[PDB]
Symmetry: C2
Subunit: 149 residues, 2 copies
């Protein structure tokens, strides 16, 4: 479905690294920067995940990384990066998040590179679906929208 | 839906680590030991993959590891293991292999731990689906069936 800035963000069901079900309500009351990647096991998506996590204030809100990687890959990625403060969530089972946010690459069954910023009421205050041929998402614009809440 | 010993091996379409499509015909004329795992990023499935690849003679035939891991996870796994001869194939897009061979855990969208041994005519000469609550596949029985072809 198509996400528009100003709308309230739809809910979704994804899996954390321990296979617990996670929904948007698990981060109630917080602003969210949602960084969506095709796979954390590719270099550009690795860099995108690290930069949003290091540059966003995590005492201010939450940075979620969502992909169709299996939970097992996301857990192993965090361990190899040596990072215990990074949230990774897996949309592999149902593409609940991908379908609700309009970011499924259907022929690949992977999620498109994308960034959403939600305020603490889950109003969508920023959206980028990264265009083809673009090197990286606009980190600064997304970080500014997240910081401005 | 159900493959039994004495049945013929179904076709499948899966992805190699470079996202090329791979089918049963790519292994024509060889016998096959097909090791199916929920995820190569879990220690038990890592052990199962290493054991079948080390113990099976690879110039009598082919050892295939098939799972719903993304190709990127399988590619990284082979690189980090320093294992450039180990074939891993991803069923993530379609569950083509899992559905054809009756080994999808539908509630998880992961493949059940299982072993199929195919002779060079693609007769299934041995099959095990590891029951829940059993520690490991019967490596010795599967390897003996493969050696005896």
């Amino acid at each position: 479905q198509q996400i528009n800035e100003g709308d309230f963000a739809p809910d979704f069901t994804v899996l954390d690294n321990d296979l617990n079900q996670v929904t948007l309500a698990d981060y109630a009351g917080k602003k969210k920067l949602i960084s969506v990647v095709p796979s954390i096991d590719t270099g550009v998506c690795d860099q995108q995940t690290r930069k949003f996590n290091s540059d966003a204030s995590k005492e201010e809100g939450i940075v979620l990384t969502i992909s169709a990687d299996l939970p097992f890959a996301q857990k192993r990625w965090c361990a190899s990066a040596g990072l215990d403060n990074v949230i990774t969530l897996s949309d592999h089972r149902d593409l609940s998040f991908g379908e609700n946010y309009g970011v499924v690459m259907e022929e690949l069954r992977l999620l498109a590179r994308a960034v959403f910023v939600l305020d603490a009421d889950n109003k969508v205050v920023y959206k980028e679906i990264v265009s083809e041929g673009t090197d990286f998402p606009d980190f600064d614009a997304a970080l500014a929208a997240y910081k401005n809440i």
